[PDB]
Amino acid sequence: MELTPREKDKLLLFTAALVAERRLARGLKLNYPESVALISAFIMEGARDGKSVASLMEEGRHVLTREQVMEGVPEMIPDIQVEATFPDGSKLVTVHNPII
Amino acid sequence: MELTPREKDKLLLFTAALVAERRLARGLKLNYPESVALISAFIMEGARDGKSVASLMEEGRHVLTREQVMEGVPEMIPDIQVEATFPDGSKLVTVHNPII
Amino acid sequence: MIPGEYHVKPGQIALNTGRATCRVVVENHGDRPIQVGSHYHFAEVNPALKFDRQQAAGYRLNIPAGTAVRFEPGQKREVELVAFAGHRAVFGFRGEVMGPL
Amino acid sequence: SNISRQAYADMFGPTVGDKVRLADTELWIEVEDDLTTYGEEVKFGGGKVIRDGMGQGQMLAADCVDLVLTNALIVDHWGIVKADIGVKDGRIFAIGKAGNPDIQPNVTIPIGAATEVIAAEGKIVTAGGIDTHIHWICPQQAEEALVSGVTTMVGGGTGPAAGTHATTCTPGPWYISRMLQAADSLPVNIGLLGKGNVSQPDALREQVAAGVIGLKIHEDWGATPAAIDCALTVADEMDIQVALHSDTLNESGFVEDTLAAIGGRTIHTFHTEGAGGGHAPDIITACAHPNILPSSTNPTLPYTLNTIDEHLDMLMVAHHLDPDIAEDVAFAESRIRRETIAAEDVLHDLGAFSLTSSDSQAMGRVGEVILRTWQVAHRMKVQRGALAEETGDNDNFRVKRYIAKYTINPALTHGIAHEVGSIEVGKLADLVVWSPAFFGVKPATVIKGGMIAIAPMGDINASIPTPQPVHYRPMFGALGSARHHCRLTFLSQAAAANGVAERLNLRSAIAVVKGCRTVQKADMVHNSLQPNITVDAQTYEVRVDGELITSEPADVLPMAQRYFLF
Amino acid sequence: SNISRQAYADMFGPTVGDKVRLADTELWIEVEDDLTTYGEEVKFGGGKVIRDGMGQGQMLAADCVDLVLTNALIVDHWGIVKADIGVKDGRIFAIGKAGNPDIQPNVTIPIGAATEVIAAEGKIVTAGGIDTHIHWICPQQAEEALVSGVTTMVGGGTGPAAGTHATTCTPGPWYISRMLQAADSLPVNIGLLGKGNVSQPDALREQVAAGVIGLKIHEDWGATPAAIDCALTVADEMDIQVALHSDTLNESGFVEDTLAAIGGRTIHTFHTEGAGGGHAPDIITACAHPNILPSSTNPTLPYTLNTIDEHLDMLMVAHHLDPDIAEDVAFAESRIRRETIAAEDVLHDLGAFSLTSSDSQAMGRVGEVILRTWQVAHRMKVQRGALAEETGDNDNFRVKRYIAKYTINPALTHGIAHEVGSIEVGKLADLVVWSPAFFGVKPATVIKGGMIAIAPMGDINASIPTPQPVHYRPMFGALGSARHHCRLTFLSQAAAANGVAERLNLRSAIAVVKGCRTVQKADMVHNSLQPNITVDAQTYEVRVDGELITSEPADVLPMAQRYFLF
Amino acid sequence: SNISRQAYADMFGPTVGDKVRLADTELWIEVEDDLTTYGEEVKFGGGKVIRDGMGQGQMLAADCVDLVLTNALIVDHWGIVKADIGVKDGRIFAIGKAGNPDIQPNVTIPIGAATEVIAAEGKIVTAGGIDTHIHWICPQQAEEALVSGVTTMVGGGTGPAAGTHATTCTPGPWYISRMLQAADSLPVNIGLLGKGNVSQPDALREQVAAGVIGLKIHEDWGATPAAIDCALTVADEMDIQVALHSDTLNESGFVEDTLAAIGGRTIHTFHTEGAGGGHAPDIITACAHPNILPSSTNPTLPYTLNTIDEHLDMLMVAHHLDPDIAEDVAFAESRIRRETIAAEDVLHDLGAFSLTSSDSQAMGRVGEVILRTWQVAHRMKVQRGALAEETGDNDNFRVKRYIAKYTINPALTHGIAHEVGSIEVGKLADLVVWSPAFFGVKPATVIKGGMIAIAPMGDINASIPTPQPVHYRPMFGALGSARHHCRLTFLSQAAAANGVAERLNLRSAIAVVKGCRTVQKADMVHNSLQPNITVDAQTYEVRVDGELITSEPADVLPMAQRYFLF
Numbered sequence A, B: 001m002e003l004t005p006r007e008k009d010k011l012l013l014f015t016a017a018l019v020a021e022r023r024l025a026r027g028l029k030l031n032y033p034e035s036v037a038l039i040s041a042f043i044m045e046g047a048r049d050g051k052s053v054a055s056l057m058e059e060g061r062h063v064l065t066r067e068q069v070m071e072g073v074p075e076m077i078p079d080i081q082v083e084a085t086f087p088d089g090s091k092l093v094t095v096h097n098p099i100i
Numbered sequence C: 001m002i003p004g005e006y007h008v009k010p011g012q013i014a015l016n017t018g019r020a021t022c023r024v025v026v027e028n029h030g031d032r033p034i035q036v037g038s039h040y041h042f043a044e045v046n047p048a049l050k051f052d053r054q055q056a057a058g059y060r061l062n063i064p065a066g067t068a069v070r071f072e073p074g075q076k077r078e079v080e081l082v083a084f085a086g087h088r089a090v091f092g093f094r095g096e097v098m099g100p101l
Numbered sequence D, E, F: 001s002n003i004s005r006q007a008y009a010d011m012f013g014p015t016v017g018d019k020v021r022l023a024d025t026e027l028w029i030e031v032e033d034d035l036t037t038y039g040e041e042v043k044f045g046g047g048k049v050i051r052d053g054m055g056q057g058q059m060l061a062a063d064c065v066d067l068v069l070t071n072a073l074i075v076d077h078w079g080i081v082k083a084d085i086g087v088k089d090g091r092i093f094a095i096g097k098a099g100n101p102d103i104q105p106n107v108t109i110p111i112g113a114a115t116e117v118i119a120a121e122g123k124i125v126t127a128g129g130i131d132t133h134i135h136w137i138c139p140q141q142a143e144e145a146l147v148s149g150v151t152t153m154v155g156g157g158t159g160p161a162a163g164t165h166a167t168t169c170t171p172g173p174w175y176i177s178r179m180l181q182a183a184d185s186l187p188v189n190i191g192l193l194g195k196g197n198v199s200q201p202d203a204l205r206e207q208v209a210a211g212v213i214g215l216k217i218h219e220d221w222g223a224t225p226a227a228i229d230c231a232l233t234v235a236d237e238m239d240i241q242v243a244l245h246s247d248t249l250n251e252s253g254f255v256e257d258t259l260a261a262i263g264g265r266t267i268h269t270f271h272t273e274g275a276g277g278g279h280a281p282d283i284i285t286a287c288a289h290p291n292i293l294p295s296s297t298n299p300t301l302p303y304t305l306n307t308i309d310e311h312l313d314m315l316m317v318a319h320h321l322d323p324d325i326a327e328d329v330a331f332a333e334s335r336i337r338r339e340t341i342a343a344e345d346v347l348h349d350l351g352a353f354s355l356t357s358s359d360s361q362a363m364g365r366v367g368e369v370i371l372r373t374w375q376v377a378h379r380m381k382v383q384r385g386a387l388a389e390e391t392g393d394n395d396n397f398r399v400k401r402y403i404a405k406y407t408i409n410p411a412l413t414h415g416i417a418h419e420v421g422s423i424e425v426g427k428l429a430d431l432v433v434w435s436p437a438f439f440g441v442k443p444a445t446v447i448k449g450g451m452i453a454i455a456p457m458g459d460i461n462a463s464i465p466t467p468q469p470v471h472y473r474p475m476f477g478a479l480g481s482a483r484h485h486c487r488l489t490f491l492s493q494a495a496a497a498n499g500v501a502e503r504l505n506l507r508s509a510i511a512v513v514k515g516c517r518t519v520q521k522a523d524m525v526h527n528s529l530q531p532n533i534t535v536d537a538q539t540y541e542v543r544v545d546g547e548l549i550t551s552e553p554a555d556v557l558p559m560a561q562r563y564f565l566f
C-alpha cells in the first residue's frame, strides 16, 4: 500500500466519522467532534467520487441540521475544511456555516 | 486486551480495508491502495475462520477482477502478502497475480 | 497505459565479448546436487564434479551474470567457460591459487 | 554468451535505447548510456555475483566503498544513464562500474568486505529534493517531505504562531538559536531564514551572526523599498540569500518600484506568479530580469479545473485576513487570476521559472513539490508537444529541465550546491530510489548521508519485510546519533566563525553557505530564459514578445487517484 | 475615528465592561481593565499594523521582546484584564501595550525585527497549570497533562510498579537519579517526591541530597506518628515540602493524634476529603489548621450522580486490596462517604480547600484537573449564587478564587512560585491560550518557556494548518535540545549544591525549591479560610460553626459530552 | 495460626508441591522449593506488611535493595522456585527472603526507605530472552522483541538494504560505527555481527577493531572453505564468535568439506535444520560435532500443517531469487524438506539442538522466538510423553531444557553470559514478569537493567492503570538517559581497548564479550547431546543410531488464536 503519513492521518478522520455515523443512526444529537468528523468524511468521499470543489462547498452544508446536533454546536463550527485527492489532485474544500 | 505492536499495526490494515469496501459497494473502480487493503483483509479473516494457507493462496485471486479496479492497477500488484494467526500459529499467505 | 512500463527495443545482447573461452565436459560423481555460479572460479568447484581442472584454470562459466548451472547426481554435460579478466588474481574459493593466474 | 534484450531488462533493468514510462504520465525517458560491460554486471543474492573472490574483492575498507547501488537508472540534470553508484564516508564516491578488479574488467567502484549493497536494478535513482519555501509551522512537516523524496528544507518559523503561519521567518537570535537546536531532531538538512523586514542593518546582521542562511522580506511585515534595500545591503556583505514576497497592495509603489529598489542585486522571488503574494497583478514580470531567481509555490501547479475555487479561503486563513472586511477580501481576490495561473505552467515549460517549492501550510502542500512538478511536465507535453531542445523520440530534455527545478536550482539559489543538489562526486549521499510505476509519488528508499532514513516497511513481526500493512516508517538513519551524522545544519559564514555550533552545542554536521550573491538567472540549469514578458493591467493577460501565453485547465491528472487512499 | 463596540470586539477581542461566557458553563467574566490606547492596538497580518516603521521598530534584539501575544484577555488571580504580553529570554517580560515607540504612544513592550507574534485577540490567556499529585506510572501522562493545560508536574514513581501504583514515591538515590535523567525527555517542568516513611532521619536526608523536592508520607508504607515526625524534622532542616496521606485505619491513632504528631509544622495534606485516603471519617477536619495546606484529588470533583458508584472498585485496584478479604472491603467502604463528598465542593467555594490536583492513575484523572475545577465552580454558582466577595454582575471573584487552586497555590505550597504559577514579570513563560468556547477543555496553544510545545494541528500536507483531522501534536518546544532549554527540573537546595545536575549530566534548566517551611494557610491566594469544622463520628455529617455543609449531586455537567468524542 | 493451601495460593501465589499450567499448553510446572518462612511473607498495599518498622527497616540505601519482586515463582534453567528477588544497582542482588531483619527472621534481602516494590505473587518471573539471529532491517524490531520478552538482540544490518535483507551483516567500520551510535536509541542490549566473508584477515580485523562481537559467514557473500578458514582464524585471535550459514548449493563442496574447513574450531551454526540456509540436504548432521553450537530459526518451529506451503515464497523474497529462473527455484525447493523439518522438533526435545532464534524478517518472526519454543515443547510432550530425565509428575525438566534455549545458551554461545542470560546474582537485572494464563505470549512487565522498560498500559487519563484500551507502551526505562543507563552495548575486547566508545561518544553502558572460543556443545545447559545422526541423500530421512527420527504436523497450536486479535 505504501501509506504516507497523510494517508494514515486520514484513516483517523474516517474512523472518527464511523463513530458519529453510528450515533446519528441511533437518533442521538451529535456533539462537536462527532459533527466535524461526519461532515469531513462526507467531503472526502465526494472527492473520491469525482465531485467538484464547488459542488462539495455547497453539499457539505446539508449533511447535518441544527436539530440533529446538541445546543451550541452549530456556533462552534463556523466552517469546516478538509483536503482530499480529487481526479485533478489534492484540493481544499471549505464549507462555511455547515450546520443550519 | 494487551495489544502488541503487530496487533495494532493490523488494525491499520483492517481500517484501510473498510474504506475500500465502502467504495467498492458504491460501484467505484478501486485504486492501488484500496485493492491491496481489501484483498489483504480478506485473507486475514480467512485465517481467523481456520482456512488453510493453500486454500487462501487460491481464494485470494478471486476477490477483485480487472473490471473492478482502475487501469494499470492489476499490473501494479504482481502479488499480495499478509500474515495472520491461523489455528496453527502465524503463517504467510502469498497470492500471486491476485487481480485478473 | 501501464504505470512505469518498459518499452524495450528488440534484439539481443552479446555477453563477455572479446574474451577467451573453452568448452569442458563435466560430470557429477557425487550423490547430492551441485550448483555453480557465473563468477565462481570453475577450477575450484566441489571435488565431486569430474572434469579437466587444469583446463578450467582461471575460468568461470560463460553465462549471464548472476545465473547458474545445476548438476544433479550423475549428470554429465558440456559447459562453456570464459577467462577471468582484471588482474587475473584468484583469492578465496578452496584456496588453491591465492594469487595471480 | 547471448541474451535477449527483454530477459536482460528483467534481470538488470533497462539499457541503452530502452524507454521507461514515468509513473502513469505520458512522459517517457530513454536510457542514454550504460557504463557496464555486458556479462560483468554485479548482482547480489543467493549464488549471485557479489561473493568473496568473485564480485567482491580483498581490499581493506579504505580501498572500497561503504555502499553500492547496483544497476541504477540515474535521472539527473546531466543525463539519464545506467550505472553503479558508490558511496563512501556518506558522500558520492563515483558513478561507474562496480566489482572486483581482481577478476573483472573496467571496475571503478571496488566492492569489498566493508561494502553494503542496495539492489537498484529496475529502479530509478535521483538526488534528494530541496524545498526552499518552508514555513516551520510544525515538526511533522519534515517526515512528510522526507517521505515524498525531499531531503533538504530551507525556511523559517517557530511553530504554530501567527508570524510563522504567514511568513517564513524565525525572528531574532533567541528563536534562531532555539530552532537550530531543534533541527538536530529532524531527519532532513536544514537552513533557516530570518526576518529581513527592518530599515536598521544591525538588526539584520545580528540574525545572520546568530545562524540564518538568508533573510525573508515579506509584505505582512512591510515589504517597503527601504526594508528591501536594507536586507540586500546586508546580504551583499554577509553572503546570504534574500527571498522576496512583494507588496501586493502596491502600497509603497508598483512592481517597477520594487525592482528599482532591488537595483540589480541578486534575489530569490517566491511564488513569482502572484497567488501566494506579490504586486497585483504583474509580479510575474520579474522573471525577465537577470538578477532574479524565480520560483513557484505548489497549489497553482498545474492549472486544473478546481484550482481557482479552492484559493480564496486558503488565501484568507494563511494571511489572517477578515472576510467581513471588504478591503481584506478585495486584496485576496486581486491575487487570484486565471490569466497568470494558466501562463505559469507554460513559463515553467519554457524555462522562465527556474524552481518549484511548497510554501508549506501557508498556501502550499509540503508533500507535493515533486509530484506537482511532474504533473506540470505531463500537462505541458500533452498540450505543447516536444520542446525545441528535444532530440530523439523521448522526453529526456523536458525531464532534465523539470528535475532541475527541485534539485540543483534551489541548491544554487541558496548557496548549498557545493554540498547537495545533484548526484555528483563529493556531494552528500542524499539519494532517492524509485520504482518506475511510482516515480515522483511514493519512493522505495530514501537515503540520507549514506544511510537509509525512511522507507516503506511491512509487518514488523513478519517472516519477510514485504507483508501488509506496508507504510513508511523511520529507519536507522533517522535515529539519535546516527541521524546527527547523516544530516547537515547550514550556517552563515559569520555564524560558523562565531562558534555558534559550539555555543549551542549542535550535534549534527555543519555546512556553510556561500555563493548566494553571485548566482544569476543565467546560472539556473536548463531554466535560464529571460523573456520579454508583459502583463495587461486591465485584463491580466500575460504576453511574451506580444504573443499571448496561456494553457487549459486539467480535469484529471496522473499521480493522483490511482495512488492515494484519500 | 469611531467604531461600534461589537465591531471592535470582533476585531480586537472584548474590552472594559464586555462579558464572556466560560465554555458552556454559567460562569461569566467581565473585562476589568484594558491597557491599550484605542486606535493604537497592534495587529499582525497582510497590510496590518506590525510592519517595518509602523507597529515594528528599529531596535536591536536586546531592546525588544522575542515574542508578543497581542490583545490577550488575561485571567489570573490578580485580575481579568485586556493587554499585550511580552516574553523575552523565555520569561514574562511585561504585561502592557506593545508596539513601536517611534510612532505610537504608551508603548511598554517594544516590537522589533527579533519579535515573533502570536495573535491572542478573542482568546483568553492563563498561566500553565501545576499538578502536585502525580503518580509517575507511565511517561504518557506528561503529554496528557500538557494537552489539558498543565505545565508543571510534581509527584513520584518509577513506572508501573506496585509501590508507584499506590504511592507518589520515587524510593531512594538510584531510582531518584534515574527519574531525574528520564525527566529531560518530558515537555513539562518536573519535581520529584521521595519516600518519607522511615524513622531514621539519614535515610530521608540521602533522598533529599539525591534530588527530591519533597517527601510523601503514605499509609501504605506506614503513616505512623514516628514516621511523620521524622519526615517533618528533615523537611524543617532541608527546606522541602511534606505531602501527607494519613492512617485511614486509625491504626496508630485518630486524626487528632496525627495532627499532634505534625505539631504545628507545615504540611500539604493530599485529598483532604478522604476518599483518596486518610483518617476515617474525619480527615477533612484538617482544613481548620493554619499549618495545613489542603488539596483535593479530582474524581470526587464535583459531586455527581455517578460519583459514589464508581469509587469502590477504583479504590481496590489503586491500593492492591483484596475484595475477598472482608477487612479489605470494609476499609475501602469507610473511605467513601456521600456526606464528606458533598461538603467538599462547598469548602472549595468558601476557600477552605486551597488546591486541586489529579492523583494520576491512582484514584485520579491526569487530564482533568483544570476541567473539574471549573465544573465545581459552575455547580457552586448554580447552587449557592454569588460569593460574598463578588462586586458587579459577573463571577470575576469566583473565577480568581478557583484559578488560584491549580496555579499559584500549588506553586506556593511546593516552593516553586518564584519560577512559575502565575503571569507575572520574571516568571517562566508557561502560558496557555484558549478560545472562550473551549476554555478549560481544549487549549488553542500551550507555551513552555517561551516556545510553543503542543497545539492542535490539522493535515500536515494541507495548504493551511486548519484542515481536518485536527488533533494535538508535539511542536518544536517539545523537541530535543529546544525542550531542555524550555523546561525546568526542580531540585532541593542540597542536591543543587552537591552538583547532582553535573553528576547525572542533566540537560535541562535547573531550578531550586525554597520557602516550603514558611507557607501557611493564610498565604493561599483567595483560599485562606480556616473554618471551625466538625465531622459527626456516626453520621459523617460535616458542620462548620454548627451549620450543616452539603450540596446536591449533578445529573449533567458542562465541559463534558459537548466536547469529547468518547 | 493456620491457613488452607488454596487460600494461601490466592494470597501469595503457589508453594511447594502446587502445580501451574503454562498458558493454554499441556505443560505443568511444580514448585520445587519455597525460600520463605510461613507467616513472614512480605506484601505491599494498604495496611499490609511493607511499612515502616514492620516489613521495612531503618537502613540506609547502601544497606538495602533498590527493588524487590515479592513472592515470585522463578522459572530458570537451575530451578523452579518461589522466592523474593532483590535488585540493586541495576543488577540481581539476591534470590531469597525479603523484609526487615529488625523484626523478621531469615531476611536476606533487606527492604528500606530506598526500596521500590513490584508485587509478583501469582506471577512467574524469568530472565529476559536473547535472540542471536537478528537482521537489522528496521528499528521497529526492537520494540516488537522487547514486548515478546526478549531483552538482548545480536545480529547485523544497516536497514532495509539488499545485503541486510539476506544476511546478518553490518559491513565495515563506517556502517558499524553508525549502527553502534544508533543502538543507544534502542531499549534492548545490542551486539553487532560484521561481514565475515573475505579471504584477507586484515579486512576482518578492521571490523572487529571497529566494534563487532562476531562475524557472519553467509553463502550470499560466498561461504567458501577459504572464507570460512579466514574468519575462524581471526575469531581465534580476537575472541569473537562466528555464525555460519553454509553453502546450500554444494558449490565449493558438501557438508563434510565445510566441516573439514572448520577444523574443530568453535562455531555457531544458524538454522541447522536447513530451510533457512545450508548444505542441501544434510546440514543438520552438524549437531553431532562437539565444536558446533546449533540453533534453529523460528518459522519451522514447530512442524504444523501449513509450514511447508508458506516456505517457498518466503525463501525467494528473503534471498533475492528469481522464480522465473529455473535454477533459482530448484535451489529454493531443495531447502524445504518435510523430513528434516519433522526431525528438528524431536532433536530439540532430545537436546541435540541447543538454541532458538528468530531470523527476523529474513525467514523468521522477531516477536515469536519464545512463543514458538514453548509450542515445540507442548507438541513434543503430546507426542513423546515424559523425558527420560523427568522426576515427579510434572514437566519441570522439559521446561528447564527449553527455557535454556533462548536464555543461557545463546548467552554462552556469544560470550555475554557473564552479563546476562539467567537470574543469578551479579547479572544485569533484565527480567520478565508473566501471568500464568499468558506465559510466553504477553508479559505483564518487562524490566531492563532494574527499570521497567515496557508494559501493558490502560487509559492514560483513567482513574487507574487498568481501564481499556490496554496495550504495550514504552515506560521510563526506555526514555533518553535512563535508557542509556539500563542497556548495554557489547563490544569486542579490541574495540573496548581502542577507545571506540569514547570516539563514537556512545552514551550507554558498555560490556565486552569473552569466552567465545572456549564454549563447546558440552557446555550448552541441558542441551549437550551429540547424536550419531545421518541424512539419506535420496529420501532425506533423518536417522540417529539407525532409528528414524520424525514427528507429526500440528493442526492447532496453543498460544495462538486464543490470544491474538489478528
Ligand code: NI
Pocket (backbone or CB within 6 Å): D245, D270, D271, D276, D277
Ligand atoms: Ni509569500
Ligand code: NI
Pocket (backbone or CB within 6 Å): D133, D135, D166, D167, D168, D359, D362
Ligand atoms: Ni510562504
Ligand code: NI
Pocket (backbone or CB within 6 Å): E245, E270, E271, E276, E277
Ligand atoms: Ni493518597
Ligand code: NI
Pocket (backbone or CB within 6 Å): E133, E135, E166, E167, E168, E359, E362
Ligand atoms: Ni496518590
Ligand code: NI
Pocket (backbone or CB within 6 Å): F245, F270, F271, F276, F277
Ligand atoms: Ni541464513
Ligand code: NI
Pocket (backbone or CB within 6 Å): F133, F135, F166, F167, F168, F359, F362
Ligand atoms: Ni538470517
